[model samples]
Target chain A: GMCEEEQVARIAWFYYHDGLTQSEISDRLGLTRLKVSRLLEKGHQSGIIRVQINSRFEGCLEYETQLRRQFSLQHVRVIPGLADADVGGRLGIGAAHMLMSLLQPQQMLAIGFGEATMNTLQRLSGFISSQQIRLVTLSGGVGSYMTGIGQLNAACSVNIIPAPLRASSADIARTLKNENCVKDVLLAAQAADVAIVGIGAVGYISQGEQLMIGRKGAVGDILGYFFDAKGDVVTNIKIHNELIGLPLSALKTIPVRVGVAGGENKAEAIAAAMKGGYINALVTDQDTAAAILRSL
Target chain B: EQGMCEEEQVARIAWFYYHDGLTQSEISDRLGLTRLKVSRLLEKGHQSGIIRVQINSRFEGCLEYETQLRRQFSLQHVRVIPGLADADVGGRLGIGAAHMLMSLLQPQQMLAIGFGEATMNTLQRLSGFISSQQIRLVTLSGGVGSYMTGIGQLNAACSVNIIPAPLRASSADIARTLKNENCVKDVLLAAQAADVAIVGIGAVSQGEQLMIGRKGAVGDILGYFFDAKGDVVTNIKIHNELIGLPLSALKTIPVRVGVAGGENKAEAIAAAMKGGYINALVTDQDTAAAILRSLEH
Candidate 1:
């Protein structure tokens, strides 16, 4: 005799994965349809079956749709907060899901820097390996294991800028951008079909006091360039020329620009990025979405 | 904050349209959208790569092969179907090509198709779609007998422009004269002006190379033989006698798709692509992999 748990598991698998109705499952198991239904119900109650929705929005479609329409965006995903996970981990899953579905063979993905982007890359390494999709870095930095996609999948084509994220001098950065190695990678980033970028909150301003946050409604930063709440680049800053990555104006031309960052601290930043049109697609958590709506 | 998201709505429409086999109007009604918007979303889903159409059969490593073939040959479009374990290379090519054709064809679009056994199979599957939709089909070559039977079953509503002469003329001069005739010229121009062209690849074996070793010809397409480099073998008498558009004429059409596959035909497929004859391609996984291997050396 099979254990009741195992029996219920099989019944649930048939009902779900196999697309068999209770009656079909009952016939296969030689049991009454009513009893099969009860067993399947028991399976769900006991957590013997878990159904994961792989869509970008999952159960938070309302927020997703609202954001897409409100911002005049192409894609938006809002996932519920995980019980034991931080916002980055939860939003990372959402970002990974979007990347997996939005990308097709032979397409290019231009990725940015920071924790959210790193988490997305970590989650997407396996898929990038299998799909062999081309990856280009938006920011210049010493290549790390996270950017080591080609190492994991020998087939993956990775194009990285051979320069630092922030140069010692603006002139150095300008010269670096002109290098053949850096120019080639930057050109590839411009032509990418999709891009995964990070949104930095204003909190980073307090840590580095040089960024002159002059009550100009500074809300967020992308590719190390600060922007006000209206999504306009805060050009008064001195470090503009020292940064290396895709420009906000250039990012607009890429078909899909996705920003993956969420938290109470990031709601304002995400909203600003959306307003500026730097990001047309967003993947965030439910709490952050509510906060963003409330802030609006 | 309670309604379906854009992704969900588009997917629902796709499911109702593709899986449930619901009419566009029916889907619009069920999904609470106008029929026009419903149609737009359906097209958006396909163009966005959100909806991928895979045959019921799975092909092992087909995706990887598709990537490699596209890269090595710099092909604009490539599809490699899996599942050779069940054989029927021609059957698979036909079904696959039919699906590609349906996706590429919009209502009122003209399709220029070539004549071959594989094309006949593809034509058979397209009967319903071609008949129901107001599609205009033109033949790439003159031999109406080769494809007329296949298009015979299509509904009378669809227009088919087939060349008015036989596949081959009695002599080179006759072929040239017929090509200049208004009847043949009109159809050839229509074919060249078509929005899309689907040509079938025919393979000539190594054995044929030995028989006709003079030109080092490896394959023939529409009766014109070509060598490994995809350069046309013009010395053959058949080149002047075949009553069809020159293979180079395929360039005039916006989208030229070549469909054919088998381990034996890799060379021909490669040669065709190298000659810049076909920008898009469809083939089995085995053949695509074989093409990649042959190019490596």
Candidate 2:
């Protein structure tokens, strides 16, 4: 039995470390493939996978470090505080306030989504009327829920474009030809004066679990599309199922792409966002920012 | 011999054009003025009048109905057009009612236009009214199926605030993109702050001839999104499913009116009435009777 436990531990270790497929480990462990997969998953959940990699590459210690090094980031803040508190609610308030402050007269602002992003938008107060300012949603609303409400309420006038977040890649190609809403928002992105977004990361937690617990995704948000732990893009996805926002590579060309995120739990996600150059700047709290700096 | 400068004269011409609906060519031909001079005159007219215009209801018949509608519902104004005979008669009556309604508009009022066959027809017939100021016109919903066919209001709104987006599009994707467009966005912004809205109600199930005959568009009109069983608009699907206040909230809006007609529209009118989407309705005799009958049902 001890031998079996050791074998399971080794398999779990290899899953994250060696990048071995789940099926491959199932065959190697002699246990049912499901059992092996469960054990590996359990190890991660129980904190057995807490190993932090201090990379030899100068830019890879913390996500902030890599993000800052890769993209000439103006400010990178990682909120480790979100790890212990109500991350969604807390970060939502902070991001909303920060975004309101950044708005100016005659500026065109583009907003992408997440529950956190919506919360931030809902909390905004006061009204400023400038002929030059416009706010537009970056993607379609998520699920059956109305993500556009808060954005529409906050912006002077909201543009309602419809495009799903993830679908078959082939379907996306075909759909784009006929979907005017998708084409329109994409066109707006190309002409956007500024963009605000939330990062996505899938680490120890599976992407599905992240979606459920986080009220969003970890690796990539439905609004911003997708990015890996290193902030690299994973391509060949449909518009409906993939992250709904602009592609990270495309974000790089934007004049102002501000990524708002926080919490110690999000360091990896934030790092991935930064690595992918999804954000030219970031907003976070002292703890996460410090942790990012310290890790650097 | 007069000391008025060329710029001052040009400004006066612009004022005349804006306030009097003087055509550029007409102004040029009448006053021996250049096109540029006529444009400047229109501009000057706006700067001078400081005119504030608003469209108000003049219930030609059924004042009691208008009053009852207002009392029963929290509405801004109620306009009831004289009831008429057939569907065609009702449609014409609806158009006439809208013209009368437009006559009441004060210059510079922000006008939000919803898409529909009736409103389209009404807008086409609107002409001969003039004001020096610019009135803004905005569409409340996305594109419809009827492209240029049902775009009379958009076209007639003209030199006022024109929303720069297609009247109809293929999918929500295109709608979203158009919403973000610069010109489209400008109109949207104007609409949010609009002081008045002129809407049209279509008879969704009013048989083949009455229903909006657009290729990709849905039936009837509440917004760009359609209403089939007269289901109350619980949520507006713009970019997402946004739960908004009920149509009842619209009654409290400063100024919101409706225009429709046709015996076939009896059910749609009843539905709109029940839903409280409009406080003021412009229609003919047969449709009004239909509305009364539906109420009994």
Candidate 3:
């Protein structure tokens, strides 16, 4: 596979080393700019040129200490604003590294569903150990989150929740949770050694904010349980259950609770989650951390 | 009239900025000059030597080391990093290897890398987003998981074609099981035809002594041990059980890069060069210096 990857190195050297333009390289080397661009992309895809820069960020890590101190959190990882865009990917990288480091043999791990958490799962697609892991999904709706987790080499016995995250009514949710199969999965999630959950936020735009739960100006959410600024679940006409996961209060007993989220949009939500004392561990990017710090 | 010429003062400022890793404002504060004056000096510094700017590129100082090694070893290319066992030698070697990798290897160039702790450490030192989808990762030696920490499938965008050939075995027939299979032999067949191979050199150090269950394993290439005289160890039955490419198989490769060196392996490396097992080398300065010392005898 690395056979044809050499042309990319030449393109990089002539581009970076010899300082040639794509058009110039095409003219000099007898190719098109499209081919030039594709070669560079292919080279990166093949991992030919791996650069190692000493990241200049005592500033970010030092600031993270303040973030930990301010929130009184157990663990906090802060990634420098390395990407101008791709905020989600940056956040995923931070979360993925923390999750991989925290993974141990014979541990019960539970994951809640969301965009950031799903992306984080994607970043953790290939790495695994031989230990048999009990992977418990927090919600039946979390089946959608299994896009890339199947590839890990770990000897895994995945336990899935059968019920949906949101039931039609509170009574139906209670009834569904009462089911023997659903209750067993719910209990399994509750007894997990470590739990990785995502924080969902009401969007900044009016159209997106329309989905925000009723009253008291909601901010953050986890496990389909919406919580406002004062750490109270936002009032909803038809709220959750059959989520097949434990309540936020039950999560307090677990040793490791990681909340992965970031971006200027999610800064307020992340800050609210921290203030709620719902998370003992946090993962985020530099800009979002700075934005949250600005409010405090 | 001033303490120095504009160019001279600029070069001094360049010295502080590039060498000392200071900002213009910091230089201004230290030298009792204005920020604009420092900025102009920086501009002049760029005008002269182009600052030899290497942000994850070539090591300017190691160029001569490479030249010397190439000449001495009759190699096609050589890259030597400074600071041997000094300030994270493994990391320094990884940086140089990554840069050379970025500089070399074209569209048609094939890649086959050996598994080693230093190789993994170097791969982890990558600062850019590099995927190995087009060119795949093949195991040149044995042992899977953390024991032989080479570049893992996680870094290569996960093509998942790792064939962990055993280091040694009780019997020859049993150990050759990893190869001679469609699952892994295609890569070995591909490896036989590999254009560029990046491998780690092993020597008589630490657990390596215990690996062979005997002494005098001066240097290692592919999956076999050899003495300082460049003789492949035929005394061991384990050599018969090796799973990956043999020394004769590797000699067919076009560009074979040996990414190893330290005070402990200088003599071993000398044997590697003398045996013509490596046509290219990515090493550190102190080890390169050691290799030079060994040649005098």
Candidate 4:
């Protein structure tokens, strides 16, 4: 939860990231140089200064090298994961940065929704993309979480899926799925060049079938989409038919379908998504990657 | 004469004291007033409706182990109380359980929760609210004594249905009298269906642990005794006749949790988990780590 805004974080950032001396920060922020020195000491005690320039664990290193080779994917990025650290938040920013660098003007950047996606959008601070990219939503219901993402990122316009996450019945969803306004937004999503989707875990079963994380035959999720443990979409499972977003196959054809996920819970989901070829580019914590490779 | 202007001065002092997270002495040091004057100003502000204090009751988890434990154990919820001073493992576990009960429970959700020594200590951990309602506290075992805890004294609004079954029966026949009798069945029915069910995970060898009974048996859960392997060791002919719900019944409810830790009960806790119980568990980090390690073998 510690961020650059905190006094302690500002001291460390000025010292380490900004390469300024303690006295300079003291002169700038108007604190005693001894106070600056003490906060830096507190930084170490608080586990803030984890300088891992030369510290690479063999497991994660081997896992990443093998992941790219094994996936046949064009790119893969791995972020350091700490047990006590905000693992998903770090990975989200990494994905956000990776996606930010690859953006082309006028490209329709579709985002698959989930907790991690929301987190990435939150951390995508001061992000004004090179172009007014058409940021679109590929999933429904999880849209309100993205309301501020567009204005914040300075996108050309945000086209959100304008329908309930799950329709009362398959027919109602099908009805709305054809409504002119609904189709208009989703049509933008279907043709997206780059997409970011969340990989959901099998263990997050709550509200019984509401999340459907561990419903008997269910094993994974991307957006509100439920898939089997084998990575294939669990079809005809009422909820799947009720979804008002791009189909799971959308990932197969999208130019860059990146999976933004990393956690102990998400290991098997990531594996399922990888095996199913749901994502070609992956942004995840190093340990989760190692854990996934071990499962393989 | 000493109205708006004087109030603004007090308000300014209050801002530094509360908003700046500064001490009164520091406020005085900066304001050039004596510490006593600064304290007086703060008191004045409070009386004038200018200063308000709030106790953030948001109890957070031990960020390190909480989420991983939730993911690993397939637990719907998990909380790790900080190892704060004066707060031993029992106190922490109790406090964690208390917050779980307070947050997860609905006031009208049938009943509050059944009790044990760990949970009793938990009620004692609440810092007390400015205003709270009467709460119902039902004892798991009949022998848990009177409403002396008056846990309901502060803010537990509701009826506490005490079981008519004696905590200890003279023999299996006495137990049988209570089990099928018209007296205790109704209380047992709702008690078993508690909204926030949190019981202590006892060692099969901690025979002294008596929420079940003290017939020299280990593991007490609502009056049902189980040995180290979580099997009923009712050689005393009183297992079924006791007036509490069965272990199977405990599993029927959602949000069920068990709170106990230390190396001594690690094996017992693991055995209970293996028996397919406790959807959520609150325990010490050391004991949780041990359980994870023990599971490896």
Candidate 5:
């Protein structure tokens, strides 16, 4: 009688949180194995126990294959459109799981900031390995990347470039980028095993950066490098020098380059980045993928 | 005819059935398969975990709000429910509070309750479980009015400790005498020993003027009016005649949960947090956002 509900809750906690076996729980609680089984069953029936499976389905796999073939990319993931949540939210759920599977102990991860990236980092904490997986941000800014890094495990090391994204003057930008602290993070990005980047549309670029670029047929941007329709980087020595982070050329050295962004409006930008060889892997929604393919 | 792989077919079936909300017959026709085949694939995909189903007791958006609220208010625990259009705030809060109570309460632990719509709704939801768990319900104050009916919903044999008097006596002397009575004194003492105390925060702006027929109050917790700064307003003569544990006594309980929501109660909730009457809280995001905004000034 004393063990009615408490027994159920305790057993559920042990089996789930403690990862104890049924037999172990029976011994711990001084109950018969049969009684422990019965209690667990009751726990489920009474809504005291919940089970959630985190797995990928094949609904979007067909589109994934198509996108991979069309873009000539190594890996492509197309998540189904479930309008119940926001675009970034749904995409982040997909990307976080993919990144979790991709990460290994002692490997370095370079990341860029966006709404989706922040959401991914928010979800990554529980799923990630806490074994010194180094995280280095792609740019220096008080943006989503800075906040996303805060979501990661303390055990996972981080390197954020200690400078403003856009310096007030090109002279100041040059000096800040050359600083030992800033140089160290850029070096980490260069040596990164896998890099997750967010693609910014031409119009999405910051006011200061856009003014610097002044439109050289720029369609999309990645890691502060603006690329035109043919996936050629918009050459502006002044703006490139003012930017404080990894140069777009450095991304070529990273073994696995991943990009997560979507929406019909972003198709041109997404395609430009892919064609430019910026991201070898892409994660996006089906409609966006279809839109990208249609435009191509 | 091009053939679909088992994995692809199952995935398609799951997406259509789960996301698209298609009937098996419809899915069968659309995919050029029999209804029986569609059913089998759906079942197989679920059992194999090809289709993930996450049952969240709380939403992620609200989790973020809860974190901010906890840090800003220096609260030990905070739960924020996402507000929905066309839903009763009190009912939603009650549901949220019920979930919290079930988790916080252990077998035979005393849970001291206060009066109000939200608290009563919480009591109603926990009626069946409280009996099974053998939780002892203790009222924080007397004259809970309509809330007495909620207590009757629980098992007749269940343990219940309630002050056997009006919430506020007709006179201060009578209230003093009631507090000294063994029936009332024992319940108040039991309340002091409670494992957790869940109280509804009442905005003094609306109800108190009628209940106590008084003025110059900010909010009510256990029928005691408090100011904007969360200090008890002893000036209200009716508060003197209130039969309940003092704010200091409430602080002794390990987990004092304040459950209320709606934009109107933001000031009251904020004041309660400032006064440190509650260590834990359950409320909607709108009310929490309101509280945060109010604190800025």
Candidate 6:
């Protein structure tokens, strides 16, 4: 009996992910589509396909609280503990965990790219159910080997849009209005109820790269939006010039914009993200929390 | 005199080759045929404007081959990577396909995955790509090993969970131990919740070069086992059964795809077709031809 059930399970797996059509699967498995359908029903009934969501953010408790007090955030996430290890890795894991927890059936979550955030996602694990969640990449990736692939891979969906993470300021401005791909995903982001992102800081390695390669000075803020290290907007133009991604100004209007990061390395950046009003919720580490307090 | 006429005749033959839908044997048969003559005609067809044959020579053929194979097998969709020519094919194809799937994914979609070569390939392939921010990548099989290879790719705002048992562990010891591990349990829980799954087709032959040298000597093909004559993959040792229930439940999921290619994989392809392992198959022309020939036998 278990063997028959197991055979049915294998047949269903092939149909679901292997891109096999119903009739085709039916023909191959020597069962009717009706039978295949029944087996799938049985599999689901047996709890062979389970689903869960993780939305816990550690560390940035104070920041998340403050951000919510200051902004109109729908939800907030903060990751705890980050005295040792790379800030990006800590934040990425936290973000991944938070995303897992927060996911609900039939919800769209848009994500943007940056070095620290990319590192955080790379460390994530334990996602396999597909009943009620959809993942999409918010922007194209940077050109650098280490960071670009990380950002690209971290995205839940690769086909959303393709905008360079670190294009020149002029290029960024142009991309917002001109690139069709950028526009499409950005529109989706704007429509999303929840947004996941990372804070960017000046003098950080990622910011430095943007400055050098993109010929654009750092916005020194949270998510992909730029601001000065002091958390002030340096340009009249909105942060995250990719146009389609949730604009820093626009994100401030969103219900849920979760910012993830940690450490003194990201204090100014975290502050900048907060100042930009893009993130209503913050996830960060302890030392960074202390720094943020000191800076405030 | 004969040579000049033959050349002119070849030119005319090539012209007809392009304009018509005749098989090689048909062309030969029409021309007072021989298999060699058909081969030469095809060569001449390319030499002239009769046929323009440009082989991508690279593994890109796998993409098209997979498409055609899926059609032949009557499967849903096929995602094949030619890079399998190199050992990296699995990784590249897995990642590329995952990214592609991400683009089209919507909210509240259920996703599923099987263990072993296919799952490992998909995990290794998922890096720096995001489809939708809320989608989850989960394992269908129980946990297999301690390495990162056993873990699914992590997304920026997504969840990952591992099944509790080693996919092919010898005893229940590993499965029991894994069940107690929080991390492994999380993945197993996710697999049970998946609404969709991405999987791979394993070849049964132990001696096949591509199967042995390329796919790390895995015995299971599309989560099933092959008999002595390579008739069907009715047996699988990984789960101590023919197929895992989660894997079988994939048919009810919104989408499922099987990816594999190369000429050496013909027999396995046939078995996959027979066992209903994949509704769609991605494979190369050589394997396609081998299957076609096998059908005649």
> For every model shown, what is its TM-score relative to the native structure?
0.43, 0.43, 0.43, 0.40, 0.42, 0.37
Per-residue lDDT over A1-296 for candidate 3, one digit per residue giving the tens place of the 0 to 100 score = 43456667778889877887899987887778889888888877767766554664665786689888988887888877645567678778788788777778778878777778877766765443455556777775532444434333424456655444554445645655665556777788878888888887762123443454635477877776667876666664245442336777777667888998776777778788867767889998788788888877
- After superposition on all C-alphas, the RMSD of every candidate to the true structure, in Å, is 22.5, 22.1, 26.3, 25.7, 21.8, 30.9
Better of 5 and 6 by DockQ: 5
Candidate 4 to truth, TM: 0.40
Against the native chain B, each candidate's TM-score is 0.78, 0.57, 0.70, 0.67, 0.77, 0.54
The sequence of per-residue lDDT tens digits that candidate 6 reaches over residues B1-297 is: 233444455655665566676676666656665778668756643322223333444444455555556566676665454443435444444544554454445664655666555455654444323222355555565422222342323323444433423344333443343343434444555565566566666653255345433433333453445442434322223444221333344455555555554445666667655555456554434555676787677
TM-score of 1: 0.43
Which lDDT tens digits does candidate 3 get at residues B1-297?
156744456657878888889987998877777898888767634422223345664555476667777788899888887664457676667666766665566643556667675666554432121332244445555442332233322322333234423344335764454354333465567667777777778776355467553656687876677877777877666577666678878888788878887779898887887887888888887888888888888
DockQ (C-alpha based) per candidate is 0.02, 0.02, 0.02, 0.01, 0.06, 0.01
* Worst lDDT 10-window in candidate 2 chain A: A144-153
The local distance difference test score of model 1 is 0.74
Top DockQ hit: 5
Worst 10 residues of 1 chain B by lDDT: B52-61
Docking class of 2: incorrect
lDDT, candidate 1, B142-186, per-residue tens? 898899756875656669999999988988999999999999999
> How far off is residue B230 in model 1, in Å?
1.1
Model 5 chain B poorest 10 in a row by lDDT: B52-61
Give the per-residue Cα lDDT of candidate 3 at B37: 84
Q: Model 5: residues >4 Å from true position, as ranges?
A: A1-59, A129-131, A142-144, A151-154, A203-214, B1-9, B12-297
Runs with alpha carbons beyond 4 Å of true place in candidate 4: A1-54, A57-59, A147-155, A203-207, A210-216, B1-297
- Judging by lDDT against the true structure, name the best candidate: 5
Better of 1 and 5 by DockQ: 5
